[PDB]
Ligand SMILES: CCCCCCCCCCCCCC(=O)O[C@@H](CO)COC(=O)CCCCCCCC
Ligand SMILES: CCCCCCCCCCCCCC(=O)O[C@@H](CO)COC(=O)CCCCCCCC
Ligand SMILES: CCCCCCCCCCCCCC(=O)O[C@@H](CO)COC(=O)CCCCCCCC
Ligand SMILES: CCCCCCCCCCCCCC(=O)O[C@@H](CO)COC(=O)CCCCCCCC
Ligand SMILES: CCCCCCCCCO
Ligand SMILES: CCCCCCCCCO
Ligand SMILES: CCCCCCCCCO
Ligand SMILES: CCCCCCCCCO
Ligand SMILES: [K+]
Ligand SMILES: [K+]
């Protein structure tokens with residue numbers, strides 16, 4: 001199959017994996033910090049989605065060093081996955097336009 | 104017409120549809136949850152725009168499971184629509200530069 | 207000049223114009239709404255930058271219909287301008303790689 | 310090496326530099342403003358990452374003019390670096406698809 | 413749930429005088445307060461929406477003010493037809509709640 | 519609307535002593551408070567802007583402090599020309615509001 005679509009699918013499954021692992025590790029890192037809110041796995045998964053999409057409502061965020069490192073990993077994974085989807089769309093469009101120009 | 108522009112327009116109308124449906128479904132999912140704020144359709148439409156653009160001020164957000172699922176749909180729709188617009192712009196630029204190079 | 211760079215510069219100046227006009231119009235739309243915070247031009251310019259970059263800290267946001275319409279215009283202008291910069295970078299890279307492949 | 314990958318690496322190291330310098334300068338600009346929260350270097354680095362990714366939780370933000378100018382620099386650096394990574398991915402995909410089409 | 417406190421419960425005013433009912437929310441609710449009038453043996457009647465917005469058919473005599481936690485319903489020059497109970501209601505958070513009501517006496 | 523409480527309403531001070539007027543906001547307003555002086559038969563006069571920023575032409579004797587809900591206007595070594603009413607004003611939320619004022623007595 002075309003490399004851009006395979007990479008898009010791989011990035012999707014990798015982002016799902018990163019969301020689950022980030023929820024687990026965020027709860028692990030935040031429990032023990034007085035005042036921490038990112039301490040139950042359901043809302044941790046919600047927060048991981050918020051973080052990967054950059055749609056950060058501000059209802060939840062890490063307060064510890066390791067929670068914030070987990071957050072950075074989730075941020076970069078989400079941003080690069082969505083950018084890879086954009087790149088795959090651009091490649092598809094470029095190929096289609098080349099063909100439409102008979103080249 | 105060129106595929107990238109047609110896809111951009113289709114993504115625009117689909118994003119409008121997703122915004123309206125997401126406002127409706129967010130109000131439907133959030134009413135009944137004590138403390139929920141995403142419970143009237145006008146500010147729900149405002150929130151849906153916030154969510155699709157990733158400009159999430161934090162004035163409104165879902166607190167229920169189904170409200171957050173609706174939110175994820177809105178997030179992905181908005182991000183992919185704007186990325187598709189970016190991809191179409193890139194295709195236009197690439198074709199123009201190919202022509203400017205006489206190739 | 208190459209179309210992508212000219213379009214990038216034009217989008218930059220247009221985004222500056224949109225930021226200034228959005229600050230002015232946001233103050234105009236928000237004054238008169240009890241509780242509104244987006245009511246002085248300096249912090250309105252700060253908010254317009256926040257909105258165009260999607261880095262919405264949540265310190266300021268519109269509460270009126272017309273303030274939120276202004277906000278949507280600023281959001282779309284910023285997102286499309288930065289996406290256009292991305293598209294121009296992609297076109298530059300594609301041309302450079304074509305040349306590096308001797309094609 | 311291919312220009313897009315070299316530019317991606319250069320943008321990565323430049324973004325790290327901008328994050329560190331922005332943390333330092335944000336603390337420098339915000340201390341002396343009553344009520345400012347962006348006043349210690351660790352959480353300033355966390356805030357700089359938040360700002361460069363546009364994942365702005367709202368736990369920290371500048372309140373002074375120069376802190377907000379630093380913030381704008383960090384915003385633009387992060388957005389353009391991630392967009393450059395997207396552009397490099399698109400160039401890689403386009404070259405791979407050209408080769409897969411035997412052209 | 414948001415508590416809406418209407419105190420005092422009874423307001424006594426001379427004819428033609430300005431009067432002000434108070435509604436205080438247990439937390440900040442922006443401008444999401446609405447004011448209703450209920451006369452004897454009648455159903456409630458929307459007077460003001462979103463703290464200050466006028467309703468078609470309501471005399472210009474009625475106005476509303478406030479934001480956050482403190483809200484005021486004002487009647488300039490009271491007259492006999494205003495004798496009624498007045499309720500505030502919030503729509504900022506689920507569930508919607510009502511104030512306990514203030515009676516207007518002349 | 520934001521309530522600005524200025525208490526006490528009258529401040530009595532000996533000549534040359536430091537004095538401090540208090541302004542308390544009903545909610546947190548950052549540093550968006552401004553201080554004005556009004557002498558007898560005069561118009562208000564901006565003394566301090568944004569809680570602590572000096573105004574050109576105002577004696578260095580005047581200063582301001584505070585953030586959030588509690589703000590202070592200070593006069594080091596009071597003199598007769600300071601006898602006036604002093605008002606605080608907030609610009610954090612619409613509408614702008616004024617404190618009730620504190621009179622300076624010597
Ligand atoms: C003069 C140069 C200034 C530029 C930045 C200063 C560097 C400070 C080191 C930052 C981490 C160590 C702070 C510390 O001792 O950890 C705890 C602080 O008490 C809490 O950790 C934290 O607050 C979270 C760490 C931030 C994680 C996100 C960083 C992305 C790589
Ligand atoms: C050890 C692995 C941990 C990794 C994540 C843990 C999985 C937990 C399941 C998450 C949903 C079920 C939680 C539940 O019982 O629903 C309610 C919780 O009481 C409220 O729903 C919620 O809080 C909203 C659900 C989040 C929606 C966004 C998710 C995007 C796919
Ligand atoms: C069943 C379908 C539901 C889907 C959405 C419902 C449509 C509601 C119309 C929305 C505007 C009118 C509301 C109104 O009467 O204006 C004021 C509301 O009192 C305040 O305006 C507002 O709250 C701001 C309007 C939102 C602006 C952003 C929208 C982007 C196009
Ligand atoms: C009618 C046209 C209106 C359009 C905008 C109005 C222009 C106002 C000038 C803005 C800066 C000067 C304000 C001032 O005097 O600095 C301080 C304000 O008291 C605090 O600085 C600030 O609040 C931060 C400045 C914002 C930085 C982000 C801007 C991105 C370029
Ligand atoms: C990068 C993720 C590291 C895993 C976090 C472990 C949490 C332990 C904190 O004490
Ligand atoms: C994916 C959208 C599902 C629709 C939400 C229905 C709300 C029902 C919650 O009880
Ligand atoms: C699209 C921008 C419209 C200008 C806003 C005018 C504000 C008037 C609100 O009463
Ligand atoms: C663009 C960065 C300028 C450096 C900020 C210096 C802070 C001094 C504020 O008084
Ligand atoms: K917030
Ligand atoms: K983006």
Ligand SMILES: [K+]
Pocket residue numbers: 055056057058158159160161261262263264364365366367
């Ligand atoms: K945000």
Ligand SMILES: [K+]
Pocket residue numbers: 053054055056156157158159259260261262362363364365
């Ligand atoms: K964002």
